[PDB]
Paper text:
The soluble glucose dehydrogenase (sGDH) from Acinetobacter calcoaceticus has been widely studied and is used, in biosensors, to detect the presence of glucose, taking advantage of its high turnover and insensitivity to molecular oxygen. However, this dimeric enzyme, composed of two identical 453 amino acid monomers (pI = 8.75), also presents drawbacks in terms of broad substrate specificity and loss of activity over time. Briefly, all crystal structures contained a tight dimer of sGDH in the asymmetric unit, the dimeric interface extending over 1110 Å2 being maintained by the presence of two calcium ions as described in Oubrie et al. interacting with the N262-D273 loop, referred to as the 4CD loop in the nomenclature of Oubrie et al.. 2Fobs-Fcalc electron density maps from the wild-type and both mutant structures all showed a different molecule instead of the PQQ-cofactor, corresponding to a PQQ modified cofactor, with the bond between C4 and C5 missing.
Residue numbers in the entry:
A (entry chain B), B (entry chain A): 1 to 452
The structure:
């Protein structure tokens, strides 16, 4: 899609909802879920706390704090995945992922791993216990961790794991592994370094499903590959798997996740269109003193090999359902009209989640078959319509709830007339006038929006 | 997708197949089908003949000649749709569409109508009889008739009817009706003027299915709207409906046809990307002497209103699964290489059909879940892989069978190792070196390609 302008974002104020801030100054609140007890459960990524919030009183209880979660103040690591077992009344399990020290690493510079872990909820003591590591030794870094964890209708865990930030910023010269897949020898050794930029599908005990797709002759936990930072993952009522993903300077994506698909990253951003992005592989640069011009690969410094999207030899490439947004090669990624933090005007929205709106007895008019996609950078939540079979999007991503907030997650109440949203505690967001602020209106908040 | 170069088309010679001409004396052969008698049935668009060819021996019989078919030598009209009833042994019906004079028209700029008609096949005399008009008074013109007629798994007729060529060439100043839908009064009066640029879904008697979608508050025969020239329509084994469509100077499309969808034409070519196309509505130019610069709306003469794709207020807009091809605004539609016909270098392929390859006992390796899309202008048949659920394309459209021929239709044998192709009698095609020829290697032929 074509970017919206600052004025188009500014007017999306959702006057048809009442806003009530339930809590603020949460410590990097990250995921929220409607609990089996009809309370709001949310995670604090930085502290590893799992909080249960009564939405009417805002009363909070720290149900559990995941011990030894590792979080860096300037990082996206910490407590990430969070899901309830779908049959919680008979299987009172919570599944998480998080960043933990990796004792198998003596290197003090990539010191952590990601672990997918199950806890058991004890209703008598109202806490979590009996941890079981389901899958350990997963990559970890400060960037592009993703970590959305959902349980599918097939009773498998689906887990997004980002590309770790390779090929940008602090990890510029590390080779991006989104396209790489494990050999059998690596699987035998539990060497999961290729589990970057993937959607994994795991049995509930963490084992590899025998019916997972094959990539390069090997079935692993990988379900799909070629992702950058896939923070959103949600099943539709008819069993399809929708996803949102953050692109680089362009081409955030809404994807339909299909078994064995290749979502193209880093070779392809968005559509395979050679439009506004090319793959500049800094790990293959002539030397490490080269600078990233940060022009999305369209213009690069000498010495970094660039591959057009159309030059990539890909297999099973799956294009996005929708890009937020796609631009042409003439696009100026250094456009100063937004101010001197030019990225704010980049044709992206930084989607942080993806939520399938299920309606209910108070369903919001017109919202059938919608996907809600919060935006960190634009301070909106997008509503994306699909057809009733969830086979295509209809029309464009409609912005809602414009504010100076980095929206991090969204759910709806069972009745469907109330949305609950998390916001980041700190960061930059685009103001109504298009410029950047790091003054967030509701830092680290749980907000409810009630349809009038 | 990004256009292939002439060199990339030239190399797609399919040396792994043996070519044999079965019939070489056909006049404007248009559709071909594998019939319920395991013979190949094909139509001749201008003569109205329906021929049956024995695939083993190549003997051919004219089964029927549809009387009073109207065809213009400079036109795409004539005998178009052609399908068998799916339970032919018990319901020996053939369904056609064709151009016939409209005695309710009293001028000869648009003197004809399209009629969807059923015939009963008489096996004892090997002919068609008992014509029944199922839907008459449909639009007709010389351009963009489409007319693919298939019977879906739901036992309904699906019929593509193009946009009649409005807003280009001889029909430049007629308002394109692809977005227009009938009022209840028009519909009740059998006024089908809005049945342009549509996929229709009809009951087998021509009536309106009670579960057809609604557009603008009216349930009509329209199933989808917003099409330009949808020449290909084919159901997949799991009941999805794939389509190919000719775009203007760009953005031929492979579409997934979803009930009630709006495929965007003429406001949107391909993706809603504002890239390489804009909608210049010549019918809205006050000055009817204005010239069409034929730069895809990106460059226009003074006096024609232009709407960007992103400026359209659309409902239920469904983007294509694949474009052949999309280019940026900097693209030069007058780039020399094709001579006085710079339009053969246009980033399109002119798809003429869409065929779901079903494999079989001798299925071609790697062709699982492919859609075969013949190209008129490039003299290739594209192979487009989809995932096993036919939810997305995988990778790119792979050209095959490069020759100086305008490929008009394709089917495969039941075992899957033979492809049968029709070629146009006349027209332009791109040569290996990228230039244009109107010397076709196999004018008006039925050809078979057998995997080696
Ligand atoms: O403008 C853009 O494209 C853009 C903007 C942001 C933004 O939010 O400011 C981000 C981002 N996402 C997270 C996150 O926690 O998900 C953190 C950051 C960050 O830059 O600090 C990204 C990206 O990571 O791709 N792209
Ligand atoms: O280069 C392009 O875009 C292009 C090329 C052709 C071509 O075949 O040469 C056509 C076309 N299609 C048919 C048909 O029978 O379907 C007839 C013609 C014609 O030009 O006479 C179209 C189009 O009608 O969009 N576009
Ligand atoms: Ca980004
Ligand atoms: Ca992608
Ligand atoms: Ca791209
Ligand atoms: Ca065309
Ligand atoms: Ca379209
Ligand atoms: Ca377009
Ligand atoms: Li590796
Ligand atoms: Li009308």
């Amino acid at each position: 899609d074509v970017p919206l302008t600052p004025s188009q974002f500014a007017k999306a104020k959702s006057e048809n909802f009442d806003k009530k801030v339930i809590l603020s100054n949460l410590n990097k609140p990250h995921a929220l879920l409607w609990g089996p007890d009809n309370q709001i459960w949310l995670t604090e990524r930085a502290t590893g706390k799992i909080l249960r919030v009564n939405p009417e009183s805002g009363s909070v209880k720290t149900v559990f704090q995941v011990p030894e979660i590792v979080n860096d103040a300037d990082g996206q690591n910490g407590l990430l995945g969070f899901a309830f077992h779908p049959d919680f009344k008979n299987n009172p399990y919570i599944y998480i992922s998080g960043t933990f020290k990796n004792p198998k690493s003596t290197d003090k510079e990539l010191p952590n791993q990601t672990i997918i872990r199950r806890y058991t909820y004890n209703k008598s003591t109202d806490t979590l216990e009996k941890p079981v590591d389901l899958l350990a030794g997963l990559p970890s870094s400060k960037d592009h961790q993703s970590g959305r964890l959902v349980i599918g209708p097939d009773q498998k865990i689906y887990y997004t794991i980002g590309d770790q930030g390779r090929n940008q910023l602090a990890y510029l010269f590390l080779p991006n592994q989104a396209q790489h897949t494990p050999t059998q020898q690596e699987l035998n050794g539990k060497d999961y370094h290729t589990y970057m930029g993937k959607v994994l599908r795991l049995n509930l005990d963490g084992s590899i499903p025998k019916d997972n797709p094959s990539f390069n002759g090997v079935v692993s936990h990988i379900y799909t590959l070629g992702h950058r930072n896939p923070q959103g993952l949600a099943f539709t009522p008819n069993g399809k798997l929708l996803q949102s993903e953050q692109g680089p300077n362009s081409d955030d994506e809404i994807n339909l996740i299909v078994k064995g698909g290749n979502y193209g990253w880093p070779n392809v951003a968005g559509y395979k269109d050679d439009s506004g992005y090319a793959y500049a592989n800094y790990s293959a640069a002539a030397n490490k003193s080269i600078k990233d011009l940060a022009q999305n690969g369209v213009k690069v410094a000498a010495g970094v090999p660039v591959t057009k999207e159309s030059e990539w030899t890909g297999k099973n490439f799956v294009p996005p359902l929708k890009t937020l947004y796609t631009v042409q090669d003439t696009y100026n990624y250094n456009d100063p009209t937004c101010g001197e933090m030019t990225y704010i005007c980049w044709p992206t929205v930084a989607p942080s989640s993806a939520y399938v709106y299920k309606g209910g007895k108070k369903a919001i008019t017109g919202w059938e078959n919608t996907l809600l996609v919060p935006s960190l950078k634009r301070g909106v939540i997008f509503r994306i319509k699909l057809d009733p079979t969830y086979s295509t999007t209809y029309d464009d991503a409609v912005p809602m709830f414009k504010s100076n907030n980095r929206y991090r997650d969204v759910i709806a109440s069972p009745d469907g007339n109330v949305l609950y949203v998390l916001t980041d505690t700190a960061g930059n967001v685009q103001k109504d006038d298009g410029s950047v602020t790091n003054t967030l209106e509701n830092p680290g908040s749980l907000i409810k929006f009630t349809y009038k």
